[PDB]
Design a protein around this ligand. Structure first.
Ligand SMILES: [Zn+2]
Length: 256
């Protein structure tokens, strides 16, 4: 029964998911002055040319674009990672207002939204096994600021009318996730967690320094989605972000 409201939101999650107060929770504030350049970090390798998108789903918390991860088609390698991580889904977190919506912050700055490209370590064989390992997932996080339209986002924006409510899905084949990336792959990296229940501590976070720009009309369309199911009272899907969590005994490393 978790969500983002006063009564079921992030301040409540620890009662069902005690790891909410754990040692490696996400997101965090990235203090750009404290993050250390790690000259031994490799360039990220983002290999999305064979990505096979299947479906888009309103899960009552966000919308997920899901990929065929039955083989090594779209993978993330390099940077801080050992081995091959397969793309399984992406989703966003966003705000009711342009001044909030991101989960990570940069020197306490909040962006309008944040894109999460979720990958799993193929050495664990399936996604459900991967989330029970400390190096099971790699999530590529990309900030969204409101400015110019992102052309490669518009196919996603166009289909949101067809998945307005919780449990609706639509076929979403032949979507190229390369169109959501900024020019630069400079990043920050730290060990953390899923930012939604069950809050598992299985994620290597890779957060790109360069935001992408989306238009006010693009993010407006995200805010027309509904948290509720069809035939239930309308609740706009806005402010589906977890606030920054204590850094505790962690260092954020910069690739640049
Ligand atoms: Zn996320």
């Amino acid at each position: 029964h978790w969500g983002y409201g006063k009564h079921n939101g992030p301040e409540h999650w620890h009662k069902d998911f005690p790891i909410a107060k754990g040692e490696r929770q996400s997101p965090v504030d990235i203090d750009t002055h404290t993050a250390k350049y790690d000259p031994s970090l490799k360039p990220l390798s983002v290999s999305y040319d064979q990505a096979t998108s299947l479906r888009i789903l309103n899960n009552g918390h966000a919308f997920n674009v899901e990929f065929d991860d039955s083989q090594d088609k779209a993978v993330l390698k390099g940077g801080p990672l050992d081995g091959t991580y397969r793309l399984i889904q992406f989703h966003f977190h966003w705000g009711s207002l342009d001044g909030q919506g991101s989960e990570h912050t940069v020197d306490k700055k909040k962006y309008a939204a944040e894109l999460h490209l979720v990958h799993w370590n193929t050495k664990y064989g399936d996604f459900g096994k991967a989330v029970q390992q400390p190096d099971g997932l790699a999530v590529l996080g990309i900030f969204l600021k409101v400015g110019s339209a992102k052309p490669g986002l518009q196919k996603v924006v166009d289909v949101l009318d067809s998945i307005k409510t919780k449990g609706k899905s639509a076929d979403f084949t032949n979507f190229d996730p390369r169109g959501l990336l900024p020019e630069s792959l400079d990043y920050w990296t730290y060990p953390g967690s899923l930012t939604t229940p069950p809050l598992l501590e299985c994620v290597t976070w890779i957060v790109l320094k360069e935001p992408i720009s989306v238009s006010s009309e693009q993010v407006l369309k995200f805010r027309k989605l509904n948290f509720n199911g069809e035939g239930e009272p309308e609740e706009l899907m806005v402010d589906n972000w977890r606030p920054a969590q204590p850094l505790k005994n962690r260092q954020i490393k910069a690739s640049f």
